[PDB]
Structures are given as C-alpha cells and as structure tokens.
C-alpha cells in the first residue's frame, strides 16, 4: 500500500526501455531536420528522455500521467508511419507491448494503495 512506490518502479522500467534496441528511435525528440513535415502531422511530440526528465523533476503526480505520455510516443509513431510494416513503426509496436506488460502492475498497485489510503 505504498503510495509513492510507482516512481522508482517507473524509473526501473524506463531503464529497461533505454536498454532495449527497439527504443533507439524514441530516446530523444524526433529530428525535425530529417523529418521536416513532422510537426504538420504531430501536435505533441514526446520521447523517453522527456518522460524520464519529467519524472526526475517531480512533475508527474501519478503513474497514469507517465503512462499517458509513453502512450503518446507510440501513437505519434502510428500517426507518422507511411505503412504498418515500416521499421520504426514495428519497433514501436514491440516496445509498446513490452511497456504495457510491465506498467500494468505499477498502475494496479498505485490505484490499490490510493484506495487503501481513503478506506
Ligand atoms: C522513418 N521514420 C518513422 C517511421 C515510422 C514511424 C515513426 C518514424 S520517426 C519519424 O518517429 O522516426
């Protein structure tokens, strides 16, 4: 019932994601010189360094907010891809499956801890 435990759990999951070769295209903001039309397609850029820095700054109040930003990395990739079999899109699908498999318990434990706090 530790209400604060999600933060270190999210730090550890971000570390695993940065160790994954599939996270390479998503570790830093998309290069606007290489993809000059990116901001025409994508309203809210997001990347894993921005997520990690937001967490370390103490600017997430809950793991749901961190989830929303990570899911935005994956939806931006889906929105930009010219095809459903593109290399970078396919890397984002595998990384998304890995992230969802691991964030499930972090979200459940946090929500359970908050319910216990208000019992
Ligand atoms: C070729 N680049 C690509 C393809 C599909 C999805 C995302 C990207 S991006 C601009 O985020 O690197």
From Swiss-Prot:
Probable regulator of the insulin and insulin-like growth factor signaling pathways. Stimulates cell proliferation through regulation of cyclin transcription and has an anti-apoptotic activity through AKT1 phosphorylation and activation. Plays a role in the regulation of cell morphology and cytoskeletal organization. The modification Phosphoserine is found at residue 90. It comes from the Eukaryota. The chain holds residues 1316 to 1434 of 1821 of the full protein. Residues 1-106 form the Bromo domain. Interacts with IRS1 and IRS2. Interacts (via bromo domain) with acetylated lysine residues on histone H1.4, histone H3 and H4 (in vitro). Expressed in myeloma and epidermoid carcinoma cell lines. It is linked to Chung-Jansen syndrome: An autosomal dominant disorder characterized by developmental delay, intellectual disability, autistic features, anxiety, hypotonia, obesity, and dysmorphic features. Coiled coil: none annotated. This is PH-interacting protein. It comes from Homo sapiens. It is found in: Nucleus. The modification Phosphothreonine is found at residue 44.
């Amino acid at each position: 019932y530790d209400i604060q435990a999600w933060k270190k759990q999210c730090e550890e999951l971000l570390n695993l994601i940065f160790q994954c070769e599939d996270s390479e295209p998503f570790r830093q903001p998309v290069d606007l010189l290489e993809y000059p039309d990116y901001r025409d397609i994508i309203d809210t850029p997001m990347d894993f360094a921005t997520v990690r820095e937001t967490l370390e700054a103490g600017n997430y109040e809950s793991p749901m907010e961190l989830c929303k930003d990570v899911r935005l990395i994956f939806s931006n990739s889906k929105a930009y891809t010219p095809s459903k079999r593109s290399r970078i899109y396919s890397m984002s699908l595998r990384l998304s499956a890995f992230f969802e498999e691991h964030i499930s318990s972090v979200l459940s434990d946090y929500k359970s801890a908050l319910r216990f706090h208000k019992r």
